[PDB]
Coordinates of C-alpha atoms in Angstrom, one line a residue:
Chain A
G1 CA 146.1 119.7 79.5
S2 CA 146.2 118.3 76.0
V3 CA 149.1 120.7 75.2
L4 CA 150.9 121.5 78.5
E5 CA 152.9 119.0 80.6
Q6 CA 155.3 119.7 83.4
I7 CA 158.6 117.8 84.0
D8 CA 161.0 118.3 86.8
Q9 CA 163.5 120.5 84.9
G10 CA 161.0 122.5 82.7
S11 CA 157.7 122.8 80.9
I12 CA 156.6 121.3 77.6
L13 CA 154.0 122.4 75.0
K14 CA 153.2 119.4 72.8
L15 CA 152.2 120.1 69.2
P16 CA 151.0 117.0 67.2
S17 CA 152.8 116.8 63.8
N18 CA 149.6 115.8 61.9
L19 CA 147.9 118.9 63.1
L20 CA 150.9 121.3 62.6
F21 CA 152.4 120.3 59.2
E22 CA 151.0 119.9 55.6
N23 CA 151.7 116.1 55.2
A24 CA 153.6 113.1 56.8
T25 CA 156.9 114.0 55.2
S26 CA 156.6 117.8 55.0
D27 CA 158.1 120.5 57.2
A28 CA 155.7 123.3 55.9
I29 CA 153.3 124.6 58.7
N30 CA 149.6 124.7 58.0
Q31 CA 148.4 128.3 57.5
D32 CA 145.6 127.9 60.1
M33 CA 148.1 127.0 62.8
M34 CA 150.4 130.0 62.2
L35 CA 148.8 132.3 64.8
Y36 CA 149.0 129.5 67.4
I37 CA 152.7 129.7 67.0
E38 CA 152.4 133.5 67.3
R39 CA 150.4 132.9 70.6
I40 CA 153.3 130.9 71.9
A41 CA 155.8 133.6 70.8
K42 CA 153.8 136.3 72.7
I43 CA 153.9 134.3 75.9
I44 CA 157.6 133.7 75.5
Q45 CA 158.3 137.4 75.0
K46 CA 156.7 138.2 78.4
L47 CA 158.9 135.6 80.3
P48 CA 162.2 136.6 81.9
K49 CA 165.2 136.8 79.5
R50 CA 166.9 134.0 81.4
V51 CA 164.3 131.5 80.1
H52 CA 165.6 129.3 77.2
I53 CA 163.3 127.7 74.6
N54 CA 164.4 124.4 73.0
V55 CA 162.1 123.4 70.1
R56 CA 162.3 119.5 70.0
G57 CA 161.3 117.4 67.0
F58 CA 160.3 113.7 67.3
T59 CA 159.0 111.0 65.0
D60 CA 157.7 107.5 65.6
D61 CA 159.5 104.7 63.8
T62 CA 157.3 104.4 60.7
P63 CA 159.7 104.2 57.7
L64 CA 158.9 106.8 55.0
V65 CA 159.1 106.4 51.2
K66 CA 159.4 108.9 48.3
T67 CA 160.9 111.7 50.4
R68 CA 164.1 113.7 50.3
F69 CA 164.6 112.9 54.0
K70 CA 166.9 109.9 54.6
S71 CA 166.4 109.5 58.4
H72 CA 164.0 110.2 61.2
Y73 CA 166.7 112.4 62.6
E74 CA 166.6 114.6 59.4
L75 CA 162.8 114.8 59.3
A76 CA 162.6 115.7 63.0
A77 CA 165.3 118.3 62.6
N78 CA 163.6 120.1 59.7
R79 CA 160.3 120.2 61.6
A80 CA 161.8 121.6 64.8
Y81 CA 163.8 124.1 62.7
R82 CA 160.6 125.3 60.9
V83 CA 158.7 125.9 64.2
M84 CA 161.7 127.7 65.7
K85 CA 162.0 130.0 62.6
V86 CA 158.3 130.9 62.9
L87 CA 158.8 131.8 66.6
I88 CA 161.6 134.2 65.5
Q89 CA 159.3 135.6 62.7
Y90 CA 156.8 136.4 65.5
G91 CA 159.3 138.2 67.7
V92 CA 161.1 135.7 69.9
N93 CA 164.8 136.7 70.3
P94 CA 167.1 134.1 68.6
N95 CA 169.3 134.4 71.7
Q96 CA 166.7 132.4 73.6
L97 CA 166.1 129.7 70.9
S98 CA 167.6 126.4 69.8
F99 CA 166.2 123.3 68.1
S100 CA 166.7 119.6 68.6
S101 CA 166.2 116.4 66.7
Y102 CA 165.4 113.2 68.6
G103 CA 164.4 111.2 65.5
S104 CA 162.5 108.1 66.8
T105 CA 164.1 108.2 70.3
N106 CA 162.5 109.2 73.6
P107 CA 158.9 108.2 72.6
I108 CA 156.0 109.6 74.8
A109 CA 154.6 106.1 74.7
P110 CA 155.7 102.7 73.3
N111 CA 155.4 102.2 69.5
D112 CA 152.9 99.4 70.1
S113 CA 149.6 100.9 68.9
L114 CA 148.3 103.4 66.3
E115 CA 147.4 105.9 69.0
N116 CA 150.9 105.8 70.5
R117 CA 152.7 106.1 67.2
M118 CA 150.6 109.3 66.5
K119 CA 151.4 110.6 70.0
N120 CA 155.1 110.2 69.2
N121 CA 155.0 112.3 66.0
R122 CA 155.2 115.8 67.6
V123 CA 157.2 119.0 68.2
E124 CA 157.7 119.8 71.9
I125 CA 158.5 123.4 72.9
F126 CA 160.6 123.0 76.0
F127 CA 161.0 125.9 78.5
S128 CA 163.8 125.9 81.1
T129 CA 166.6 127.9 82.6
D130 CA 170.3 127.2 83.1
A131 CA 170.1 127.5 86.9
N132 CA 173.4 126.8 88.5
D133 CA 173.2 127.9 92.1
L134 CA 173.2 124.3 93.4
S135 CA 176.3 123.5 91.2
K136 CA 178.1 126.6 92.5
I137 CA 177.3 125.7 96.1
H138 CA 178.7 122.2 95.6
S139 CA 181.9 123.5 93.9
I140 CA 182.5 125.8 96.9
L141 CA 182.0 122.9 99.4
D142 CA 184.1 120.6 97.3
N143 CA 187.0 123.1 97.4
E144 CA 186.8 123.3 101.2
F145 CA 186.1 119.7 102.3
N146 CA 187.4 117.4 99.6
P147 CA 190.9 116.5 101.0
Chain B
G1 CA 184.5 112.7 99.9
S2 CA 184.0 111.0 103.4
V3 CA 181.9 114.2 104.3
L4 CA 180.5 115.8 101.2
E5 CA 177.9 114.2 98.9
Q6 CA 175.8 115.8 96.1
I7 CA 172.1 115.1 95.5
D8 CA 170.1 116.6 92.7
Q9 CA 168.4 119.3 94.8
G10 CA 171.3 120.3 97.1
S11 CA 174.6 119.3 98.9
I12 CA 175.1 117.3 102.1
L13 CA 177.9 117.4 104.7
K14 CA 177.6 114.1 106.7
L15 CA 178.7 114.2 110.3
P16 CA 178.9 110.8 112.1
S17 CA 177.1 110.9 115.5
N18 CA 179.7 108.7 117.2
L19 CA 182.3 111.3 116.2
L20 CA 180.3 114.4 116.9
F21 CA 178.5 113.7 120.3
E22 CA 179.6 112.6 123.8
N23 CA 177.8 109.3 123.9
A24 CA 175.1 107.1 122.2
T25 CA 172.1 108.9 123.9
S26 CA 173.7 112.4 124.3
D27 CA 173.1 115.6 122.4
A28 CA 176.3 117.3 123.8
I29 CA 179.0 118.1 121.1
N30 CA 182.6 116.9 121.8
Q31 CA 184.8 119.8 122.5
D32 CA 187.4 118.7 119.9
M33 CA 184.7 119.0 117.2
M34 CA 183.5 122.5 118.0
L35 CA 185.8 124.3 115.5
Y36 CA 184.8 121.9 112.7
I37 CA 181.3 123.3 113.2
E38 CA 182.8 126.8 113.1
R39 CA 184.6 125.8 109.9
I40 CA 181.1 124.9 108.4
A41 CA 179.7 128.2 109.8
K42 CA 182.4 130.2 108.1
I43 CA 181.8 128.6 104.7
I44 CA 178.0 129.2 105.1
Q45 CA 178.6 132.9 105.8
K46 CA 180.4 133.4 102.5
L47 CA 177.5 131.8 100.4
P48 CA 174.7 133.9 99.0
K49 CA 171.9 134.9 101.4
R50 CA 169.4 132.9 99.3
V51 CA 171.0 129.6 100.5
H52 CA 169.1 127.8 103.2
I53 CA 170.7 125.3 105.6
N54 CA 168.7 122.4 107.0
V55 CA 170.4 120.5 109.8
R56 CA 169.0 116.9 109.6
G57 CA 169.2 114.4 112.4
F58 CA 169.0 110.6 111.8
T59 CA 169.4 107.5 113.9
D60 CA 169.5 103.8 113.1
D61 CA 166.8 101.6 114.7
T62 CA 168.7 100.3 117.7
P63 CA 166.4 100.7 120.7
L64 CA 168.0 102.7 123.6
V65 CA 167.6 102.1 127.3
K66 CA 168.1 104.4 130.4
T67 CA 167.6 107.6 128.5
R68 CA 165.2 110.6 128.9
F69 CA 164.5 110.2 125.1
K70 CA 161.3 108.2 124.3
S71 CA 161.7 107.9 120.5
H72 CA 164.3 108.0 117.7
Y73 CA 162.5 111.1 116.5
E74 CA 163.2 112.9 119.8
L75 CA 166.9 111.8 119.9
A76 CA 167.4 112.9 116.3
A77 CA 165.7 116.2 116.9
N78 CA 167.8 117.1 119.9
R79 CA 171.0 116.3 118.0
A80 CA 170.1 118.3 114.9
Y81 CA 169.0 121.2 117.2
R82 CA 172.3 121.2 119.0
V83 CA 174.4 121.4 115.8
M84 CA 172.1 124.1 114.5
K85 CA 172.5 126.2 117.7
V86 CA 176.3 125.9 117.4
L87 CA 176.2 127.1 113.8
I88 CA 174.3 130.2 115.2
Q89 CA 176.9 130.7 118.0
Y90 CA 179.6 130.7 115.3
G91 CA 177.8 133.4 113.2
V92 CA 175.3 131.9 110.8
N93 CA 172.1 134.0 110.6
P94 CA 169.1 132.1 112.1
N95 CA 167.1 133.3 109.1
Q96 CA 169.0 130.7 107.0
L97 CA 168.7 127.8 109.5
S98 CA 166.2 125.1 110.3
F99 CA 166.5 121.6 111.9
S100 CA 164.8 118.3 111.0
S101 CA 164.3 115.0 112.7
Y102 CA 164.0 111.8 110.5
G103 CA 164.2 109.4 113.5
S104 CA 165.1 106.0 112.0
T105 CA 163.7 106.9 108.5
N106 CA 165.6 107.5 105.2
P107 CA 168.6 105.4 106.1
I108 CA 171.8 105.8 104.0
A109 CA 172.1 102.1 103.8
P110 CA 169.9 99.1 105.0
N111 CA 170.0 98.4 108.7
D112 CA 171.5 94.9 107.9
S113 CA 175.1 95.2 109.2
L114 CA 177.0 96.9 111.9
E115 CA 178.8 99.2 109.4
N116 CA 175.4 100.3 107.9
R117 CA 173.8 101.0 111.3
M118 CA 176.7 103.3 112.2
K119 CA 176.4 105.0 108.8
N120 CA 172.8 105.7 109.6
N121 CA 173.6 107.5 112.9
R122 CA 174.5 110.9 111.6
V123 CA 173.7 114.6 111.3
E124 CA 173.4 115.9 107.7
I125 CA 173.9 119.6 106.9
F126 CA 171.7 120.1 103.8
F127 CA 172.4 123.2 101.6
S128 CA 169.8 124.2 99.0
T129 CA 167.7 127.2 97.7
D130 CA 164.0 127.7 97.2
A131 CA 164.4 128.2 93.5
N132 CA 161.0 128.7 91.8
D133 CA 161.6 129.9 88.3
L134 CA 160.4 126.6 86.7
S135 CA 157.3 126.7 88.9
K136 CA 156.5 130.3 87.8
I137 CA 157.1 129.4 84.1
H138 CA 154.6 126.5 84.5
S139 CA 152.0 128.7 86.3
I140 CA 152.1 131.3 83.4
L141 CA 151.8 128.6 80.7
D142 CA 149.0 126.9 82.7
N143 CA 147.1 130.3 82.8
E144 CA 147.4 130.6 79.0
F145 CA 146.9 127.1 77.7
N146 CA 144.8 125.1 80.2
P147 CA 141.3 125.5 78.8
Chain C
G1 CA 141.9 126.4 124.7
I2 CA 140.7 127.9 121.3
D3 CA 141.5 131.5 121.2
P4 CA 138.9 134.1 120.1
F5 CA 141.1 134.8 116.9
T6 CA 141.6 131.2 115.9
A7 CA 137.8 131.0 116.2
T8 CA 136.7 134.0 114.1
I9 CA 139.1 134.0 111.2
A10 CA 137.6 133.5 107.7
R11 CA 139.2 131.3 105.1
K12 CA 138.5 133.8 102.2
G13 CA 141.6 135.9 103.1
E14 CA 144.0 132.9 103.2
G15 CA 146.8 132.6 100.7
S16 CA 146.9 129.6 98.3
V17 CA 147.0 126.3 100.2
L18 CA 149.3 124.7 97.6
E19 CA 152.6 126.2 96.5
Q20 CA 155.2 124.7 94.1
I21 CA 158.9 125.3 94.2
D22 CA 161.4 123.6 91.9
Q23 CA 162.4 120.9 94.4
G24 CA 158.9 120.0 95.6
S25 CA 155.4 120.8 96.7
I26 CA 154.2 122.6 99.8
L27 CA 150.8 122.5 101.5
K28 CA 150.6 125.6 103.7
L29 CA 148.3 125.1 106.7
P30 CA 147.7 128.3 108.7
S31 CA 147.7 127.8 112.5
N32 CA 143.9 128.0 112.8
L33 CA 143.3 125.0 110.5
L34 CA 145.2 122.7 112.9
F35 CA 145.6 124.1 116.5
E36 CA 143.5 125.6 119.2
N37 CA 145.9 128.5 119.3
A38 CA 149.3 129.8 117.9
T39 CA 151.2 129.4 121.1
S40 CA 150.9 125.7 122.0
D41 CA 150.8 122.3 120.3
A42 CA 147.2 121.5 121.3
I43 CA 145.4 120.1 118.1
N44 CA 141.9 121.4 117.5
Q45 CA 140.1 118.1 117.3
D46 CA 137.1 119.7 115.6
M47 CA 139.4 120.7 112.5
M48 CA 140.7 117.2 111.9
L49 CA 138.5 116.7 108.8
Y50 CA 141.2 118.6 106.9
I51 CA 144.1 116.5 108.1
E52 CA 142.3 113.3 107.2
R53 CA 142.0 114.5 103.6
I54 CA 145.7 115.0 103.4
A55 CA 146.4 111.6 104.8
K56 CA 143.9 110.1 102.3
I57 CA 145.6 111.8 99.3
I58 CA 149.1 110.8 100.6
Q59 CA 148.2 107.2 99.7
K60 CA 147.8 108.2 96.0
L61 CA 151.6 109.1 96.1
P62 CA 154.5 106.5 95.7
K63 CA 156.8 105.2 98.5
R64 CA 159.7 107.3 97.1
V65 CA 158.0 110.5 98.1
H66 CA 159.3 112.0 101.4
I67 CA 156.9 113.9 103.6
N68 CA 158.4 116.6 105.9
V69 CA 156.2 118.4 108.3
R70 CA 157.5 121.9 108.9
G71 CA 156.7 124.3 111.8
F72 CA 157.1 128.1 111.8
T73 CA 156.4 130.8 114.4
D74 CA 156.6 134.6 114.5
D75 CA 158.1 136.7 117.3
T76 CA 155.0 136.3 119.6
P77 CA 156.6 135.8 123.1
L78 CA 156.5 132.3 124.6
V79 CA 153.6 131.7 126.9
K80 CA 154.4 128.2 128.4
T81 CA 157.4 127.3 130.5
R82 CA 157.6 124.0 128.6
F83 CA 158.7 125.6 125.4
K84 CA 162.2 127.1 126.0
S85 CA 162.5 128.6 122.5
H86 CA 160.5 129.3 119.3
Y87 CA 162.5 126.5 117.7
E88 CA 161.2 124.1 120.4
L89 CA 157.6 125.4 120.0
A90 CA 157.6 125.0 116.2
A91 CA 159.2 121.5 116.5
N92 CA 156.5 120.4 118.9
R93 CA 153.7 121.7 116.7
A94 CA 155.2 120.0 113.6
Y95 CA 155.8 116.7 115.5
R96 CA 152.2 116.8 116.7
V97 CA 150.8 117.1 113.1
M98 CA 153.2 114.4 111.9
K99 CA 151.8 112.0 114.6
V100 CA 148.2 112.8 113.5
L101 CA 149.2 111.8 109.9
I102 CA 150.5 108.5 111.3
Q103 CA 147.3 108.0 113.3
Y104 CA 145.4 108.5 110.0
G105 CA 147.4 105.9 108.1
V106 CA 150.5 107.6 106.6
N107 CA 153.5 105.3 106.6
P108 CA 155.9 106.4 109.4
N109 CA 158.8 105.4 107.1
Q110 CA 158.1 108.4 104.8
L111 CA 157.6 111.0 107.6
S112 CA 159.9 113.5 109.2
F113 CA 159.5 116.9 110.9
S114 CA 161.3 120.2 111.0
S115 CA 161.4 123.5 112.8
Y116 CA 162.2 127.0 111.4
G117 CA 161.6 128.8 114.8
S118 CA 160.6 132.4 114.3
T119 CA 160.9 133.6 110.7
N120 CA 158.8 136.8 110.9
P121 CA 158.5 139.8 113.1
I122 CA 155.3 141.3 114.5
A123 CA 154.6 144.1 112.0
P124 CA 152.1 147.0 112.2
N125 CA 148.9 146.5 110.2
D126 CA 149.5 142.7 109.8
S127 CA 146.2 140.9 109.1
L128 CA 145.1 138.1 111.3
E129 CA 145.5 135.8 108.2
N130 CA 149.1 136.9 108.0
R131 CA 149.6 136.1 111.7
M132 CA 148.1 132.6 111.2
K133 CA 150.3 132.1 108.1
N134 CA 153.4 133.1 110.1
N135 CA 152.5 130.3 112.6
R136 CA 151.7 127.7 109.9
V137 CA 152.7 124.2 109.6
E138 CA 153.8 123.1 106.1
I139 CA 153.7 119.7 104.5
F140 CA 156.6 119.5 102.1
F141 CA 156.8 116.8 99.5
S142 CA 160.2 115.9 98.0
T143 CA 162.5 113.1 96.9
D144 CA 166.3 112.5 97.5
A145 CA 167.0 111.8 93.8
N146 CA 170.7 111.7 92.9
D147 CA 170.7 110.5 89.2
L148 CA 172.1 113.8 87.9
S149 CA 174.7 113.9 90.7
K150 CA 175.9 110.4 89.9
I151 CA 176.3 111.4 86.3
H152 CA 178.4 114.3 87.2
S153 CA 180.5 112.3 89.6
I154 CA 181.4 109.8 86.9
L155 CA 182.4 112.6 84.5
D156 CA 184.3 114.6 87.1
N157 CA 186.4 111.6 88.2
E158 CA 187.3 110.8 84.5
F159 CA 188.0 114.3 83.2
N160 CA 189.1 116.2 86.4
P161 CA 191.4 113.7 88.2
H162 CA 193.3 115.1 91.2
Chain D
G1 CA 191.2 121.0 55.3
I2 CA 192.7 121.7 58.8
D3 CA 193.1 125.4 59.2
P4 CA 196.4 126.9 60.4
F5 CA 194.6 128.1 63.6
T6 CA 192.9 124.7 64.4
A7 CA 196.4 123.3 64.0
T8 CA 198.4 125.6 66.4
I9 CA 196.1 126.2 69.3
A10 CA 197.4 125.0 72.7
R11 CA 195.1 123.3 75.2
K12 CA 196.4 125.1 78.3
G13 CA 194.2 128.2 77.6
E14 CA 191.0 126.2 77.2
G15 CA 188.2 126.5 79.8
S16 CA 187.1 123.6 82.0
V17 CA 186.0 120.7 79.8
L18 CA 183.3 119.7 82.3
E19 CA 180.6 122.1 83.5
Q20 CA 177.7 121.3 85.8
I21 CA 174.3 123.1 85.8
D22 CA 171.4 122.1 88.1
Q23 CA 169.7 120.1 85.4
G24 CA 172.7 118.2 84.0
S25 CA 176.3 117.9 83.0
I26 CA 178.0 119.5 80.0
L27 CA 181.2 118.3 78.3
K28 CA 182.4 121.3 76.3
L29 CA 184.4 120.4 73.2
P30 CA 186.1 123.4 71.4
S31 CA 186.0 123.2 67.6
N32 CA 189.7 122.2 67.3
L33 CA 189.2 119.0 69.4
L34 CA 186.8 117.6 66.8
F35 CA 186.8 119.3 63.4
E36 CA 189.3 120.3 60.7
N37 CA 188.0 123.8 60.9
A38 CA 185.2 125.9 62.4
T39 CA 183.2 126.5 59.2
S40 CA 182.4 123.0 58.0
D41 CA 181.4 119.6 59.4
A42 CA 184.5 117.7 58.4
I43 CA 185.8 115.6 61.4
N44 CA 189.5 115.7 62.1
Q45 CA 190.1 111.9 62.0
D46 CA 193.5 112.4 63.9
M47 CA 191.6 113.8 67.0
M48 CA 189.2 110.9 67.4
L49 CA 191.1 109.5 70.4
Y50 CA 189.2 112.0 72.5
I51 CA 185.7 111.1 71.2
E52 CA 186.4 107.4 71.7
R53 CA 187.0 108.1 75.5
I54 CA 183.7 109.8 75.8
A55 CA 182.0 106.9 74.1
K56 CA 183.8 104.6 76.5
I57 CA 182.7 106.5 79.6
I58 CA 179.1 106.7 78.3
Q59 CA 178.8 102.9 78.9
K60 CA 179.4 103.5 82.6
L61 CA 176.1 105.5 82.6
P62 CA 172.5 104.0 82.9
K63 CA 169.9 103.7 80.1
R64 CA 167.9 106.5 81.6
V65 CA 170.5 109.1 80.8
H66 CA 169.8 111.2 77.7
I67 CA 172.7 112.4 75.7
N68 CA 172.2 115.5 73.6
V69 CA 174.9 116.7 71.2
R70 CA 174.7 120.5 70.9
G71 CA 176.3 122.7 68.1
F72 CA 177.2 126.4 68.4
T73 CA 178.7 129.0 66.1
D74 CA 179.7 132.6 66.3
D75 CA 179.1 135.3 63.6
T76 CA 181.8 134.1 61.2
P77 CA 180.2 134.4 57.7
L78 CA 179.2 131.1 56.0
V79 CA 181.8 129.8 53.6
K80 CA 180.0 126.9 51.9
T81 CA 176.9 127.1 49.7
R82 CA 175.6 123.9 51.4
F83 CA 175.0 125.6 54.8
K84 CA 172.2 128.2 54.3
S85 CA 172.3 129.4 57.9
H86 CA 174.4 129.2 61.1
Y87 CA 171.6 127.1 62.6
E88 CA 172.2 124.6 59.7
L89 CA 176.0 124.7 60.1
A90 CA 175.8 124.0 63.8
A91 CA 173.1 121.3 63.3
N92 CA 175.4 119.5 60.8
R93 CA 178.4 119.6 63.1
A94 CA 176.4 118.3 66.1
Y95 CA 174.8 115.5 63.9
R96 CA 178.3 114.5 62.7
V97 CA 179.6 114.1 66.3
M98 CA 176.5 112.3 67.3
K99 CA 177.1 109.8 64.4
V100 CA 180.7 109.3 65.6
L101 CA 179.4 108.4 69.1
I102 CA 177.1 105.8 67.4
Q103 CA 180.1 104.4 65.4
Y104 CA 181.9 104.1 68.7
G105 CA 179.2 102.1 70.4
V106 CA 176.8 104.6 72.1
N107 CA 173.2 103.4 72.0
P108 CA 171.4 105.4 69.3
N109 CA 168.3 105.1 71.6
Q110 CA 169.9 107.6 74.0
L111 CA 171.1 110.1 71.4
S112 CA 169.8 113.4 70.0
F113 CA 171.3 116.6 68.5
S114 CA 170.7 120.3 68.7
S115 CA 171.7 123.6 67.2
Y116 CA 171.9 127.0 68.8
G117 CA 173.1 128.8 65.6
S118 CA 175.2 131.8 66.3
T119 CA 175.3 132.7 70.0
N120 CA 178.3 135.1 70.1
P121 CA 179.6 138.0 68.0
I122 CA 183.1 138.5 66.8
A123 CA 184.7 140.7 69.5
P124 CA 187.9 142.8 69.4
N125 CA 190.8 141.1 71.3
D126 CA 189.0 137.7 71.5
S127 CA 191.6 134.9 72.0
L128 CA 191.7 132.0 69.6
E129 CA 190.6 129.8 72.5
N130 CA 187.5 131.9 72.8
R131 CA 186.8 131.6 69.0
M132 CA 187.1 127.8 69.3
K133 CA 184.8 127.8 72.4
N134 CA 182.3 129.9 70.5
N135 CA 182.2 127.2 67.8
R136 CA 182.1 124.2 70.2
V137 CA 180.1 121.1 70.3
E138 CA 178.7 120.3 73.8
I139 CA 177.6 116.9 75.0
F140 CA 174.8 117.5 77.5
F141 CA 173.7 114.7 79.9
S142 CA 170.2 114.9 81.4
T143 CA 167.1 112.9 82.3
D144 CA 163.3 113.6 81.7
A145 CA 162.4 112.9 85.4
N146 CA 158.8 113.9 86.3
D147 CA 158.4 112.5 89.8
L148 CA 158.1 116.0 91.5
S149 CA 155.7 117.1 88.7
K150 CA 153.5 114.1 89.2
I151 CA 153.3 114.9 92.9
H152 CA 152.3 118.4 92.2
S153 CA 149.6 117.4 89.7
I154 CA 148.0 115.1 92.2
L155 CA 147.9 117.8 94.9
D156 CA 146.8 120.6 92.4
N157 CA 143.9 118.4 91.2
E158 CA 142.7 117.8 94.8
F159 CA 143.1 121.2 96.3
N160 CA 142.7 123.5 93.3
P161 CA 139.8 122.1 91.4
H162 CA 138.4 124.2 88.5

């Protein structure tokens, strides 16, 4: 519910930035949230090795002052990287992990309200696989029938 | 090209009914097309066992007189069934085969021109798999995080 | 008519009614929830409450959703002259359920039916629930999305010319 | 600067530039087609012809397509103080290529970048093509479609209430 959402090519755990991090321009994780990341790490470790985990950082488009970060892309990158590193510290194999920065792109909801702007400041843990059976079927048929 | 098309959940070989069958209300395959079905059967036999083949019948919405068939669903069903049976005769395991009837539904193109009506009279051989890795991932996450 | 096994089977032992695969959703309807028996296409009119719900919930889905009614049998021998194969028997059962959905207000433009013929043998120690599942009708919900395919086509034409 | 291996490598031995997986398309760009070397984020300005084409073809795709620029390394040790990890090095390379796409007219609203850090060891008898592939940037084309997920949600809520 509040955390889990399904999309057609994988699953998403949505972690609000204001809950996860120390302040609005920080990439340090709140100590009382560390074992929630461990909880996620433990579930990942039980999944098949073929599952990939992409830790995705997003911001809204509120400009930020008095910070070392010079773009929403940089802030989002540092946040996603931090969460990814903690997953590794709690036992997830790095061969299953990547991080992404979306900056202010791909918002959950339009940046048209205070509620929506807060929704857009989040880290998403995206679970998927690199399934290619359909692609391989198509390539074989293409070889045969494409004149 | 003319025959092969990819969609996001599988591949399609499109066989025009006017080329494949004896006449507009017949389900008998033209003798000079039989080894084209064999050609398809041979490619299927080389694919992994996990591939399923659904032979899909479609019509346009031209009414038909002086026929034993009482609906587009019945005509489409008989045509798809015939092609499926020939695939079995040429060696495809029945455990990989089903047939479908769409009647006049799901047209390729709107029934607004002679060219489009002819396009809509076809049998599609649909190749896919019952992949469920993403569904299983989601079920595991749902167990854990849905309060 | 209703067979003494259709009549007696409890619902507790059934598998999950809803299954998900990566390309769509499946409502699995064992024979006894739809038909008088597993060897003909005669609808049990006294079970139609369940089909009405499905029709009702199908209105909460968009026009783009495709609904495919799928028929299965096991290796039970054919009883009636009118079914010449298990493929035919399963097609008739699926078609029948599809028509009930239409009767109950589902848009015919979104409906199709399929037949898988026999897909399971008769096995020693099979439960009655497993026999009813082997003669199920499924309602399969999917789309024919081709967005990702169109992307690949554009790229393949540009970077892999013949 | 350009390293004597970036400079010399032939294109004949490269793998396919375009790969398809079931969730999207991947353009695989070995290090030498983009950067002066495999250990820094300095773009080879003399290779930018190739990036311009990609930007050009990205306009033939719809707004709904998401473009993710992905950086990879192997276990080559870090050369520069400024990269503190392979994750950081790959992120910087990916970010750099993403910015070139923006320069060349790709809508920033469709762009993101990723880093996979090191994903391959240094192996005996590796070709130079394989080293360049291990330090590639990928452009990954996908969507966040949720049509099938929304169908399942509706059905699960109705038939599997808590």
